[PDB]
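Lab notebook, bench 4. We co-purified these components, and the gel suggests they stay together. Before we commit to crystallization screens, I want a quick structural picture of the whole thing.
Request: model the full complex, all chains together.
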Amino acid sequence: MRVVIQRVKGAILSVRLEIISEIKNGLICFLGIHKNDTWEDALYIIRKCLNLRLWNNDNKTWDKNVKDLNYELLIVSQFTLFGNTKKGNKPDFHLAKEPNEALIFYNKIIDEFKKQYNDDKIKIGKFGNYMNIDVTNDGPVTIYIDTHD
Amino acid sequence: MRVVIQRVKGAILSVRELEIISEIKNGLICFLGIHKNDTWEDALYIIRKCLNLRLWNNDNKTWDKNVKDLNYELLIVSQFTLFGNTKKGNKPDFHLAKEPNEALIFYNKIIDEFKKQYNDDKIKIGKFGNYMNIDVTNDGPVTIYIDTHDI
Ligand SMILES: NC(=[NH2+])NCCC[C@@H](N)C(=O)O
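Here is the predicted assembly.
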């Protein structure tokens, strides 16, 4: 699976527009799910999101993680991360997991995020819906991981 | 070269008490990571796709219009953390990222080219190397990732 991790002062997530999720300091994680992903692919993303040391702990750089500072996570599902753009300019999403299967996988991932950290600290979107996210990027600090490495 | 493209209704960049230096309305924010062994052909591929990827709908059609077609803007923000290696451990390390003194030369070259291949007034930038705060209204959201070393 693929993940783009961005570090935020906060994020406001809204749908067609009414705010339906919000977080202060922490991480927005765009989570694309490859169609051949295993529950081991999930665990790698979760371990990494919860544990990656992305904050300066005053005086020592790259030291504290989301759990350490008691920060929040917003997980947004982004199938467009499997938009192959090597052919034309029309991205093709043929590696992406099928929407239904994907929702079931996405959910489990969220359960586990809650099981691994804290369930008040994990926010979400409306899986396959138009969303509008005001993100305050801190740094900014972008982190990419394709677990197929 | 590594890039994360995000579709935006707008974007507001501020550097250090915060001061606003850059704004775009509708268009693309582009977190651009520059590999140690990047050549100019790597850069052109980045510049091309950002300008030419059809990330917007139009009438019937989906994935049909690119940033230029709509007279939209780009905000290009260098982001070495894209080469933050996370295979080993929970501390990121950036050994694969290019050296700051040259990255800066490469990034400007790139910015010029971004203007040359579109329009001078449609390309906003960050403040290379410096700490930045960026408000992004993500439209979709739509996230695209390209690693040129896959080509
Ligand atoms: N899908 C979504 N909610 N947001 C992204 C825009 C996708 C659009 N090309 C489409 O309508 O297919």
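Helices of chain A lie at 39-51, 99-116. Worth comparing against the SEC data before the next meeting. Residues 65 and 127 of chain A are 26 Å apart (CA to CA).
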